[PDB]
Amino acid sequence: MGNALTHYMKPDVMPGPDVVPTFDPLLGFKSRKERVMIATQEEMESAKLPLEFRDYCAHLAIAYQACRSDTFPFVYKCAHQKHEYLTCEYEDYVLRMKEFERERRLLERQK
Amino acid sequence: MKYLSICSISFVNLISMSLSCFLLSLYFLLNDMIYFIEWELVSLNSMSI
Amino acid sequence: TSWLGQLMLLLSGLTMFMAGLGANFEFDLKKIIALSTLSQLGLMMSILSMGFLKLAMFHLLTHALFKALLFMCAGAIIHNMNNSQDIRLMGGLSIH
Amino acid sequence: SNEEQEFIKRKHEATLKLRQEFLKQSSNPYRHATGEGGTVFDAGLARFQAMRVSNYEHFKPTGKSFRTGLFAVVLPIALYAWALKAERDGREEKYRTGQVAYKDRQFKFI
Amino acid sequence: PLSLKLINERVLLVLKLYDKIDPSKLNVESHFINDLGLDSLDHVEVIMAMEDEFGFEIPDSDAEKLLKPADIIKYVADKEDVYE
Amino acid sequence: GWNKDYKPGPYPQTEKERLAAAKKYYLLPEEYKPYADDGLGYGDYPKLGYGLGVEAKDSYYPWDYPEHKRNQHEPISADHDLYSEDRWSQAEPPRYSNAYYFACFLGVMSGCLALYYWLDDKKMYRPVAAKQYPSPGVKHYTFE
Amino acid sequence: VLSMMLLIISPNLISILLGWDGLGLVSYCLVIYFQNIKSYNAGMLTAL
Amino acid sequence: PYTVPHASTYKVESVPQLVEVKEALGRQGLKDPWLRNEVWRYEPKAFGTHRSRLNTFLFRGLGVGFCAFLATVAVEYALGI
Amino acid sequence: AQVPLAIVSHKRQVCSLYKRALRNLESWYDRRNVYRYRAVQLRARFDENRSKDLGEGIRLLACGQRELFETRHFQPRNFANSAGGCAFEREVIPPDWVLDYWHPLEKAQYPEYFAKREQRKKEFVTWWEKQYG
Amino acid sequence: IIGGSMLNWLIFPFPYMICLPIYMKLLTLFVCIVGGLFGYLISLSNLF
Amino acid sequence: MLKIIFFLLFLIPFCFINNMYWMVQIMMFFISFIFLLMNNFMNYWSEISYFLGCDMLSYGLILLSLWICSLMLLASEMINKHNNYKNLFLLNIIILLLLLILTFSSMSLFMFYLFFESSLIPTLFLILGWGYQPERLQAGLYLLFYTLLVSLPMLIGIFYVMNKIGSMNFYLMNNFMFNYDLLYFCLLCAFLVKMPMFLVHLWLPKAHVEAPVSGSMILAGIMLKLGGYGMLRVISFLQLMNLKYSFVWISISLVGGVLVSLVCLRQTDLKALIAYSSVAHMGIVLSGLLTMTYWGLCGSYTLMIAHGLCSSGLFCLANVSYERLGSRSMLINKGLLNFMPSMTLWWFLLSSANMAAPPTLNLLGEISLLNSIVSWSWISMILLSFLSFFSAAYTLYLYSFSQHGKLFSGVYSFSSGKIREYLLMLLHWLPLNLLILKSESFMLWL
Amino acid sequence: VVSYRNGPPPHSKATKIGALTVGGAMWWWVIWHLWHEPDHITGEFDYPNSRKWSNTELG
């Protein structure tokens, strides 16, 4: 049970799965910064990145592909750099783990 | 096949083919490259078996 | 994202449950290992019903390795127990 | 019952005589040494063959046979022909009326 | 590879491991009912003992046609195809 | 020695024809039992065992033919294909009836389909938002 | 194994049908390799 | 069946797992003649026990694996560290 | 060459029921000591019951057959080399007359064996003339 | 033995990132532990 | 053409010379090689000599006729070992092959009809002369009276077409179109009997069994294809009326394919089961012919070509067990893997060709036929799956029960396999996998 | 070989050496990956509590 079960009991309290931010992004008055891409579209499509992996930090994935192709097939030689790409995803996950949560707070303040 | 084991012949042949296919598979992961060859049999109604 | 994927996911998880219960109640060696093959098929078809080709392919290669290893083990044990595939007759093979 | 044991004993004597005939005829060295292939003459095999081939001589048009020939053959043929004609007429009136577009019709053979 | 002496040793070993049979009275030609005191279900226990010992299945007609240990030796040697 | 010589004949209306047909098929008179007088039913051929197949018959009996489990000059059953050892035969009689097996299988299937498709819109989820993908028209923000 | 490679390297549905029929037929034959009615019934089941 | 033994070798009282069944049958008031046919089946020398077989099976190469792991650690600190 | 007779006695019926009951008990209880304990329990169950009459014995034999049909294991243990086992008749031996249809150059690979076969053929034809001739 | 780490570095050009709580990451390990301690000792048989 | 016809006409005096049985099949394979050389054909009629010409459908059918007759002389060595009438057998085979070449290379409908119904008299002669059964009289009379009873009113239909049009040529009759029920029934029902239906089949399983091996080759190899060729020539000017009345024949053929595929599971003869097996595949051919698509016509031509080889090759396999085991019964034919292990390669290679097989031309004919029938209606997906499943449910039964299991006890000593038989079943299977290469030859006759 | 009511014939040195070698190989692989990568069994990345974050930053 858990996060689905409360969605059966209190649907107006708990937001749905993979919910977009319904309210204003500037409602919390942080004036929070804008995520700016380092790698643009043409070198994203030059590296044959799939559409499910074109995140806000795809330059680290491009550098991971470059270091994998630099020491192929023994790609563990810069294995920690993989973790670097991984922790960027973790940072994005942390942002997602905030982007849901304050939304529930934004759905609690109106309740 | 005479004076020899057909199992040993098949064993050495399939280790050689498996090593060749493995070394081909490592080259096809470095480039993310897909090949698709096509041999026509019969064409009718713009559809080719 | 299809009703085909939903139905295939249900039937793949159901054959996982079927294979686990059947191999827990099966008294034949090679039939237990064929039920283990069924359980791994349920695992791969349910993870591709989620939609993960690389996970399905990785578990496919892994299952092929260890399951050919199990069947070679079972064949050697059956060939020394003289064609008796019943798991009740076999016993204590760790010493022998 | 005492009548059962006599019947089983008589059947066993007949089976023993037929078994002795089979052991005489199956290992015949002269019949093997002729070189022409064949089988030991079994009556039940020929009875089974003529049972499987000839069956019109015991056939009469009764109600049970008519029910079997209706529900086994003619009724699936009639239902399948009715279904095919109904589906093709329903598609053909839509095709001839003009309710389907040119680029939205199934089986263009393209 | 087996032998008649080995199979005879198998049969007398299994029949002398039975506590309802005295090993002094036990013999290769000893009858299972007239010479030795055995129940109708005791001979079935002897038959399944020979089945578990020799690793095959003995039918019921061949169970009731065995009355001596030498008959069991002749039945086993005919099934497993040894005569020397 | 052909199919016209050895063949099933007319139905035994009288008892002497039944005795002659029993002696013709190498069967004792008590064992012989012809078919019905309906349109499909055979005439003069014996009705053999339709209880259970060839696997039910004794494999430890010394047969003249170990394959098909029959002796010499024994009348082959009319549905010998359907009651063969290969198809639709059991060595032991089944423990349950025919409908119990299918009833339990479709009962478990109906329960599993029902309980799955009731819960198809109660999938769980982590405390996570939608996956943000970059677009030239819509921009997204970080938390720092 | 050759029929299995003919199934793997094929993206065409007709050639997957080629490898499919090859896998089914040689799998049925290798099941019925042993000469008894159990292998007969097993081959009939794995063929259908 | 080479060098078959006699019935005087097999004794019920040597093994615990069969004299437990004999004691349970004596408590129930029954006797059994086929215990001496299964004395060889439980042998502590030829076949071992349950606890020795588990330690043989689960930890067959744990000491050799730990020695090789110490060797890998010792050669890794000389080069990697 | 004693062909078995199809009549089965009542003592043969209860002996077959005892054998099949202990085989089902061996299938249900895999450990040998537990199977031995339950086998002595079933033997005592038979031995307390053997003093009755014939009609009551027939009715209770039918009841025991119904009980054994009720408690029958779904995977009964059978010997592999016997009939009905897991590996019964895995190879089929053709009769020896196909050895008479070999090529003479193929027959030259085992000339002592084929000479002994040709010697044994005359003994077999005199034995067949003695037996069935 | 080597086909786990030999293919995990090869079949994944982009590794999946896992951020899970303490009761779900080792949940499959705890289920494997209770299945190992459950599927063995239940099959142990004693008298009575 | 006239070269092949005059080649067979001057091969006629080879029969009257003593000890000349094996030279005739040598010259028949030589003229099959020459016919392999003359392959400059397109969809229209080429090599026009008087009333004789050839297009691609006619080329494939004459080449199949020459291959089946050349293997038919190779299969019948039982006629040569005995003093059975070799000269009459060779004359009947040459005359029948000449009539098949003349009825396939016919430019017009009437000469096609004339040599088409001239062909059934040598088949009658082979069935009543060289068979090994007391019911050869029941075999030939059923065949002749079925085909004659339904083919006599086709002559009235043929001259009604001649009186309405004027010509007999196929191309000039392709221009016209008729809207009559009885003309359609006359010009269709003779071919609807000549290829097996469900209702009209009876002559087939009672004429294949009691014939010789050569009657089995000529019946299941090329004379179930005379009706297919006739319908391929007649359907072009009867399109409107066959579109009205084709659902009855297609439904009857599909349900009859399912039912006859259920019959073969209850068959105890090897030669009867292939006889009913010819009914099931030609049911798919008949169901794909009446949809009038490009794919249905092309896949029908491909499946008739690929079926005339495989059914004849299966009928040679049932003959080489009938010559040795003494009977065609399926109970006797058991465990031939331990008797003839090298034959079991050809049994499974020709039984797999009867179903869908990976390298055979039968799959390329079956794929292009199921395309048209699924395109015809969606309800046919229920019964094409049942028919194509039951086809290998029964076809694996003949190989499984004849070539696997315990041996039949009480069988006397017979001879081993021969190089002629291995060559005979070699040439029934290597054309089935060498013709997927250059398959645009044997498929695109349009 | 055949054995009756006894153990097997005594094993060669090669089988015992191979058994200890493959057991040492498996356990060396397990303990080596335990020492070099202990983070894979647990959470490789930390999971902070969603109820721990302050409401004064966004809310």
Side-chain angles (χ1 to χ4, degrees), chain A, chain B, chain C, chain D, chain E, chain F, chain G, chain H residues 1-80, chain I, chain J, chain K residues 1-134 136-446, chain L:
Chain A
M1 303 276 158
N3 301 46
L5 180 63
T6 63
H7 182 74
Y8 187 72
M9 308 285 179
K10 314 152 211 303
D12 61 56
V13 176
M14 184 67 168
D18 290 331
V19 66
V20 293
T22 315
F23 293 144
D24 200 54
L26 273 297
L27 186 63
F29 316 123
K30 182 48 72 173
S31 166
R32 44 211 191 101
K33 323 321 181 273
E34 182 179 0
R35 317 165 76 178
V36 184
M37 294 177 71
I38 291 181
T40 53
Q41 183 55 0
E42 66 272 15
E43 68 273 16
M44 201 145 48
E45 80 190 6
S46 164
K48 276 164 74 85
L49 281 167
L51 266 296
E52 63 173 26
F53 284 116
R54 293 179 175 186
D55 271 6
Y56 284 93
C57 46
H59 48 273
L60 300 184
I62 278 170
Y64 181 45
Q65 281 172 281
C67 191
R68 272 187 82 245
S69 169
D70 224 72
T71 61
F72 210 79
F74 322 108
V75 302
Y76 55 99
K77 297 296 197 301
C78 52
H80 63 94
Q81 293 179 356
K82 157 189 165 171
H83 163 263
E84 163 68 45
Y85 161 68
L86 273 186
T87 188
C88 203
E89 292 282 325
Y90 167 63
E91 287 302 313
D92 168 72
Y93 204 93
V94 161
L95 294 177
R96 279 212 284 163
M97 212 155 88
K98 294 152 141 173
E99 190 74 40
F100 187 81
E101 167 62 43
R102 65 167 285 268
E103 174 164 12
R104 184 231 290 161
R105 303 217 221 275
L106 281 197
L107 183 62
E108 262 181 352
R109 196 250 301 274
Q110 303 214 350
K111 188 61 191 300
Chain B
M1 269 165 208
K2 52 191 185 303
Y3 322 122
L4 215 53
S5 286
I6 182 173
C7 316
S8 159
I9 295 154
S10 315
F11 157 74
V12 174
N13 273 118
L14 295 202
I15 300 299
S16 50
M17 293 180 183
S18 164
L19 188 62
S20 176
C21 285
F22 192 65
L23 290 176
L24 280 167
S25 161
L26 272 296
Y27 187 47
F28 274 25
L29 271 163
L30 190 149
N31 296 136
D32 213 343
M33 149 174 60
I34 310 173
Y35 287 166
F36 167 75
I37 64 179
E38 181 211 30
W39 201 66
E40 179 80 30
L41 281 169
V42 56
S43 166
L44 73 164
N45 266 349
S46 71
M47 293 182 286
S48 58
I49 297 89
Chain C
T1 174
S2 296
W3 71 274
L4 292 175
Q6 288 173 6
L7 192 53
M8 205 66 219
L9 189 152
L10 174 60
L11 283 149
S12 168
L14 271 184
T15 199
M16 293 177 70
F17 197 48
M18 191 265 258
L21 295 175
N24 263 286
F25 276 120
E26 188 74 30
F27 280 113
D28 271 26
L29 180 69
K30 258 162 86 187
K31 287 212 199 301
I32 277 169
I33 308 181
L35 278 155
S36 167
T37 298
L38 293 174
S39 161
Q40 297 319 293
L41 294 174
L43 200 43
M44 309 175 268
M45 268 186 226
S46 192
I47 190 55
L48 61 83
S49 285
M50 311 305 248
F52 296 99
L53 306 90
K54 272 171 278 163
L55 302 189
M57 197 58 219
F58 186 38
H59 194 63
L60 182 55
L61 296 158
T62 299
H63 162 257
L65 296 166
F66 63 71
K67 187 60 62 68
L69 190 57
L70 285 175
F71 265 115
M72 283 165 57
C73 275
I77 286 176
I78 278 170
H79 203 246
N80 286 350
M81 290 265 158
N82 196 236
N83 314 324
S84 63
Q85 325 182 323
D86 209 299
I87 206 170
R88 294 165 283 239
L89 288 161
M90 294 182 286
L93 276 297
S94 179
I95 295 300
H96 313 309
Chain D
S1 174
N2 206 12
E3 198 191 288
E4 171 193 280
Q5 282 102 28
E6 204 60 78
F7 157 74
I8 289 177
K9 210 166 290 289
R10 279 149 47 213
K11 189 52 189 160
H12 187 232
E13 292 180 353
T15 312
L16 266 167
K17 293 182 183 293
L18 292 176
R19 178 184 146 94
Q20 283 303 313
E21 174 148 40
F22 176 72
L23 301 203
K24 182 175 73 175
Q25 283 313 149
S26 178
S27 62
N28 209 340
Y30 315 125
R31 190 51 170 83
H32 273 246
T34 47
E36 302 154 17
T39 44
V40 187
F41 170 64
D42 197 285
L45 266 68
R47 296 312 166 126
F48 190 45
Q49 282 184 20
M51 193 290 304
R52 271 268 186 272
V53 175
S54 71
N55 265 346
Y56 178 70
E57 309 181 359
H58 325 308
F59 167 74
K60 36 174 60 59
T62 61
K64 156 160 197 313
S65 173
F66 173 67
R67 274 192 291 122
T68 313
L70 178 63
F71 295 135
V73 171
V74 188
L75 190 140
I77 281 173
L79 283 192
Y80 190 53
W82 160 79
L84 286 171
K85 186 194 168 60
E87 198 262 341
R88 269 195 66 88
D89 271 4
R91 217 169 65 234
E92 191 90 22
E93 62 182 2
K94 291 174 70 175
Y95 284 160
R96 286 278 290 270
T97 288
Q99 297 161 217
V100 62
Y102 269 131
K103 57 169 172 54
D104 291 331
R105 174 201 311 230
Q106 281 160 27
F107 287 99
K108 295 204 273 314
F109 279 103
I110 206 74
Chain E
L2 298 190
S3 283
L4 281 193
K5 185 193 149 314
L6 303 173
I7 279 176
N8 189 359
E9 283 298 313
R10 303 266 277 279
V11 161
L12 311 179
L13 176 60
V14 176
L15 274 297
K16 87 167 61 153
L17 280 173
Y18 195 43
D19 291 330
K20 294 222 201 283
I21 282 176
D22 295 331
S24 70
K25 199 184 286 185
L26 191 50
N27 211 36
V28 296
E29 301 276 280
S30 66
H31 191 272
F32 270 133
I33 301 299
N34 316 323
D35 291 331
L36 276 69
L38 281 192
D39 203 348
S40 304
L41 316 171
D42 283 339
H43 195 278
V44 189
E45 272 198 353
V46 169
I47 281 300
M48 311 185 328
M50 301 324 317
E51 281 184 8
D52 291 331
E53 159 74 40
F54 274 116
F56 45 77
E57 186 81 45
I58 292 177
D60 51 353
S61 48
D62 291 331
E64 61 94 20
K65 274 212 291 293
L66 294 175
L67 276 301
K68 295 191 292 182
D71 281 349
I72 304 181
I73 289 153
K74 279 188 177 184
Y75 183 77
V76 162
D78 273 355
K79 188 177 200 97
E80 293 179 353
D81 213 349
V82 65
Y83 307 99
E84 77 193 10
Chain F
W2 294 107
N3 286 323
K4 54 162 193 43
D5 275 355
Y6 323 121
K7 72 187 290 184
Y11 186 78
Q13 285 71 240
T14 183
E15 200 256 345
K16 189 51 93 189
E17 198 167 334
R18 175 162 304 118
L19 297 190
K23 205 152 53 54
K24 183 165 75 173
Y25 280 100
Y26 293 113
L27 268 201
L28 298 188
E30 22 239 57
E31 348 187 77
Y32 177 98
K33 215 90 34 89
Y35 282 83
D37 290 74
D38 44 353
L40 311 193
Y42 309 108
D44 173 287
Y45 204 77
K47 198 160 164 318
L48 277 296
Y50 289 162
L52 190 59
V54 166
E55 290 180 355
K57 311 184 39 178
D58 192 23
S59 65
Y60 290 123
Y61 191 87
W63 299 108
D64 287 330
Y65 307 97
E67 81 293 337
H68 320 115
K69 293 183 177 65
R70 61 176 299 278
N71 286 294
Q72 198 196 11
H73 296 299
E74 160 165 343
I76 297 169
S77 182
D79 312 292
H80 181 52
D81 305 74
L82 173 59
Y83 293 108
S84 184
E85 172 156 30
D86 169 46
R87 69 210 39 190
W88 202 77
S89 63
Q90 293 274 120
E92 317 296 320
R95 166 69 177 84
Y96 310 108
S97 54
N98 189 32
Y100 167 79
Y101 284 130
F102 288 92
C104 293
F105 182 55
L106 315 174
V108 168
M109 281 335 287
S110 52
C112 289
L113 275 295
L115 188 153
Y116 183 63
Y117 273 106
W118 173 56
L119 294 174
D120 209 5
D121 62 357
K122 277 74 69 177
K123 296 180 176 67
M124 52 205 198
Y125 53 95
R126 299 253 59 80
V128 68
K131 183 93 170 133
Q132 299 171 18
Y133 279 120
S135 294
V138 181
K139 59 184 178 181
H140 297 90
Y141 294 122
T142 187
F143 271 66
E144 79 176 4
Chain G
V1 177
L2 177 65
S3 314
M4 181 84 197
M5 282 74 75
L6 287 169
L7 189 144
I8 300 299
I9 336 160
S10 289
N12 200 4
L13 279 149
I14 313 181
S15 190
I16 294 169
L17 183 50
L18 183 148
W20 210 262
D21 269 319
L23 279 194
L25 286 179
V26 191
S27 76
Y28 153 76
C29 285
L30 277 149
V31 162
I32 67 155
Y33 174 65
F34 279 163
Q35 303 277 110
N36 54 4
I37 198 67
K38 195 175 292 292
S39 307
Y40 197 115
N41 303 353
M44 262 305 317
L45 194 44
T46 196
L48 293 197
Chain H
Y2 293 71
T3 73
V4 295
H6 283 250
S8 56
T9 305
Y10 303 136
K11 289 169 280 293
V12 176
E13 288 95 8
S14 67
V15 293
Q17 320 188 19
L18 296 181
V19 70
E20 271 189 349
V21 187
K22 194 160 200 166
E23 195 261 332
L25 283 177
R27 194 191 331 170
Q28 276 197 186
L30 293 170
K31 71 183 74 59
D32 61 357
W34 286 119
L35 271 185
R36 296 187 313 151
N37 201 27
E38 283 135 10
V39 163
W40 64 272
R41 191 185 297 299
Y42 315 100
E43 194 66 46
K45 189 130 172 61
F47 299 98
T49 176
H50 185 273
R51 267 85 204 175
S52 75
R53 277 195 294 265
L54 211 53
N55 283 0
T56 318
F57 179 76
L58 291 203
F59 313 119
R60 174 168 275 107
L62 190 53
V64 194
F66 198 65
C67 282
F69 156 75
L70 271 43
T72 313
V73 158
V75 73
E76 212 275 334
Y77 290 165
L79 312 177
Chain I
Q2 263 84 60
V3 182
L5 194 47
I7 47 171
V8 176
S9 300
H10 164 70
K11 47 172 289 294
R12 205 160 101 91
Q13 273 169 357
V14 69
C15 280
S16 74
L17 196 147
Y18 178 59
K19 192 163 191 286
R20 288 165 27 201
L22 288 182
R23 282 312 184 200
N24 191 25
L25 204 60
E26 171 176 300
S27 178
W28 273 112
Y29 296 98
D30 55 356
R31 307 292 103 195
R32 265 292 180 279
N33 58 5
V34 181
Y35 151 73
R36 192 74 257 167
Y37 172 64
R38 293 307 212 271
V40 176
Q41 283 209 348
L42 189 147
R43 185 43 191 297
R45 188 177 177 181
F46 267 96
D47 273 330
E48 61 89 20
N49 191 179
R50 44 141 181 71
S51 63
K52 293 182 183 293
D53 56 276
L54 194 143
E56 184 54 52
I58 281 295
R59 182 198 71 83
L60 190 57
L61 182 77
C63 287
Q65 261 171 357
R66 181 56 217 195
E67 170 81 15
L68 181 53
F69 175 72
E70 202 263 354
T71 187
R72 191 176 40 86
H73 199 234
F74 43 85
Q75 292 222 345
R77 186 212 305 249
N78 48 1
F79 306 98
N81 294 320
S82 55
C86 295
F88 182 51
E89 65 183 1
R90 255 171 181 187
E91 53 176 0
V92 168
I93 297 286
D96 44 354
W97 53 264
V98 303
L99 291 167
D100 279 320
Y101 277 96
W102 280 23
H103 201 55
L105 305 177
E106 266 196 312
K107 278 178 180 172
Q109 282 167 337
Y110 314 107
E112 284 102 9
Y113 172 67
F114 271 95
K116 195 66 70 68
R117 179 174 169 83
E118 201 70 30
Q119 166 184 304
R120 209 62 51 184
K121 274 183 191 171
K122 287 176 232 152
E123 305 194 349
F124 181 72
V125 73
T126 61
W127 187 36
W128 192 88
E129 273 158 42
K130 182 175 73 175
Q131 183 62 255
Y132 304 115
Chain J
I1 283 178
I2 74 172
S5 186
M6 182 255 268
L7 282 71
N8 179 46
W9 287 107
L10 261 59
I11 207 167
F12 283 0
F14 317 104
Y16 290 149
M17 192 305 298
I18 295 299
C19 183
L20 277 170
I22 198 67
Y23 48 86
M24 268 167 148
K25 191 87 177 62
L26 311 93
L27 202 173
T28 180
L29 181 80
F30 180 73
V31 173
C32 286
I33 281 300
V34 66
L37 277 296
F38 170 73
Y40 195 81
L41 315 173
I42 283 298
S43 59
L44 265 296
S45 178
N46 46 357
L47 263 184
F48 298 92
Chain K
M1 61 285 298
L2 278 168
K3 333 175 176 49
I4 321 292
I5 292 171
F6 271 100
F7 200 93
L8 275 297
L9 272 175
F10 283 63
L11 196 61
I12 289 172
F14 267 49
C15 319
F16 312 115
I17 312 169
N18 290 318
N19 296 115
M20 264 276 165
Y21 183 76
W22 286 114
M23 280 285 314
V24 182
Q25 60 102 26
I26 283 164
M27 298 308 287
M28 269 185 191
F29 275 115
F30 192 60
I31 202 60
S32 174
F33 169 69
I34 291 174
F35 203 60
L36 282 170
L37 259 66
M38 46 200 282
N39 197 14
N40 51 295
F41 291 122
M42 196 175 155
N43 72 322
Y44 58 93
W45 295 91
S46 312
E47 274 152 38
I48 301 108
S49 295
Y50 306 95
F51 68 100
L52 298 147
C54 197
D55 69 318
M56 184 73 212
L57 169 63
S58 289
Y59 179 73
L61 286 190
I62 293 160
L63 188 58
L64 182 57
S65 308
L66 282 161
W67 203 249
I68 287 301
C69 283
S70 296
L71 288 174
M72 212 165 88
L73 274 183
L74 195 62
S76 305
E77 206 262 352
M78 211 55 178
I79 315 299
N80 181 53
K81 166 167 71 77
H82 299 166
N83 220 344
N84 286 318
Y85 291 148
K86 302 186 296 293
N87 320 322
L88 202 41
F89 191 53
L90 285 154
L91 180 63
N92 269 352
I93 280 181
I94 291 171
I95 277 176
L96 176 53
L97 171 64
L98 198 40
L99 288 171
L100 286 153
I101 291 184
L102 275 155
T103 188
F104 282 147
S105 74
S106 175
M107 210 89 68
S108 307
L109 192 50
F110 174 63
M111 272 86 68
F112 154 74
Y113 164 74
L114 193 145
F115 302 125
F116 165 72
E117 299 267 318
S118 315
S119 281
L120 59 92
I121 294 92
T123 315
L124 183 67
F125 284 163
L126 268 69
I127 286 167
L128 281 71
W130 287 264
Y132 312 95
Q133 273 274 90
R136 296 166 311 197
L137 321 183
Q138 193 163 328
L141 284 187
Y142 278 171
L143 183 140
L144 187 145
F145 283 139
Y146 269 39
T147 56
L148 216 57
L149 188 153
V150 298
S151 176
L152 279 187
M154 182 179 72
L155 193 44
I156 321 179
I158 276 168
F159 289 108
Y160 175 67
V161 174
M162 198 206 202
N163 292 312
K164 194 95 181 81
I165 292 177
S167 195
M168 271 305 178
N169 198 18
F170 283 137
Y171 195 87
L172 310 178
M173 182 179 71
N174 275 5
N175 185 27
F176 284 73
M177 173 93 64
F178 303 100
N179 300 344
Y180 292 96
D181 313 335
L182 285 162
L183 178 61
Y184 162 76
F185 285 138
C186 282
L187 275 171
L188 264 293
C189 278
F191 309 128
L192 271 294
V193 176
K194 274 288 306 170
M195 62 166 38
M197 271 274 277
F198 169 53
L199 311 193
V200 317
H201 52 7
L202 293 324
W203 61 280
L204 205 63
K206 294 185 178 55
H208 280 181
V209 163
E210 282 87 357
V213 64
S214 301
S216 283
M217 310 265 268
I218 201 76
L219 276 176
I222 205 63
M223 293 177 70
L224 295 182
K225 283 91 201 170
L226 295 170
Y229 178 76
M231 267 164 33
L232 282 169
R233 295 317 180 163
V234 175
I235 277 168
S236 166
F237 58 92
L238 294 174
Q239 308 185 64
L240 181 136
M241 186 63 72
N242 191 84
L243 275 172
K244 200 156 84 75
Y245 287 125
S246 83
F247 71 102
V248 194
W249 319 120
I250 285 180
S251 85
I252 278 174
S253 315
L254 284 182
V255 181
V258 176
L259 290 181
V260 172
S261 314
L262 286 165
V263 172
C264 308
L265 300 157
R266 301 296 292 272
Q267 283 297 317
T268 68
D269 272 339
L270 280 171
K271 187 178 288 293
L273 201 154
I274 313 163
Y276 284 107
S277 186
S278 282
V279 193
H281 297 341
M282 292 306 288
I284 315 170
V285 163
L286 178 48
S287 297
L289 270 167
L290 301 194
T291 68
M292 283 145 189
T293 64
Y294 212 98
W295 280 67
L297 265 59
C298 286
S300 169
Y301 168 50
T302 301
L303 203 54
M304 293 182 286
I305 286 297
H307 182 267
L309 289 162
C310 74
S311 188
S312 68
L314 282 183
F315 272 131
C316 292
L317 286 160
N319 179 48
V320 302
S321 305
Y322 177 58
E323 282 181 352
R324 315 199 189 277
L325 281 73
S327 168
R328 282 156 285 104
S329 197
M330 182 75 78
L331 274 72
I332 302 189
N333 300 289
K334 265 186 55 77
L336 291 172
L337 189 40
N338 307 109
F339 278 151
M340 309 172 248
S342 305
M343 211 67 87
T344 307
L345 177 59
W346 309 116
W347 290 96
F348 182 76
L349 274 177
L350 286 177
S351 164
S352 77
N354 218 17
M355 68 195 59
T360 61
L361 206 55
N362 298 69
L363 175 61
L364 188 153
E366 190 177 2
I367 279 171
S368 298
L369 270 186
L370 298 203
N371 287 132
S372 190
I373 304 167
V374 174
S375 170
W376 184 67
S377 187
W378 75 270
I379 303 174
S380 177
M381 293 183 286
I382 297 89
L383 282 72
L384 279 182
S385 60
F386 280 38
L387 165 55
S388 297
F389 164 71
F390 276 139
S391 280
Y394 77 78
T395 307
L396 282 166
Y397 160 68
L398 101 98
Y399 161 71
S400 199
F401 202 78
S402 57
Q403 304 285 300
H404 173 267
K406 291 176 70 69
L407 264 52
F408 187 66
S409 299
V411 56
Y412 297 128
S413 79
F414 44 85
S415 291
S416 59
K418 306 304 205 182
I419 306 184
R420 172 192 57 88
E421 297 173 353
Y422 297 149
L423 175 66
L424 161 73
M425 271 85 68
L426 178 63
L427 306 162
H428 274 139
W429 165 79
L430 262 182
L432 284 176
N433 307 318
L434 273 184
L435 283 184
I436 51 161
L437 321 167
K438 200 64 65 172
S439 183
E440 61 86 20
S441 178
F442 271 91
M443 184 177 177
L444 317 173
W445 68 278
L446 280 165
Chain L
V1 297
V2 286
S3 309
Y4 183 98
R5 280 187 209 243
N6 214 357
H11 295 319
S12 63
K13 187 60 66 68
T15 65
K16 294 185 285 184
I17 279 297
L20 268 71
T21 308
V22 301
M26 182 194 134
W27 283 111
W28 163 78
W29 193 264
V30 164
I31 300 162
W32 184 56
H33 278 179
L34 271 193
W35 183 254
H36 272 167
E37 24 152 337
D39 206 6
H40 206 120
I41 282 292
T42 181
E44 301 94 7
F45 299 94
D46 290 331
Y47 199 87
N49 218 349
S50 57
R51 66 163 84 239
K52 186 262 290 180
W53 292 316
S54 73
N55 208 8
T56 185
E57 58 90 22
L58 276 296

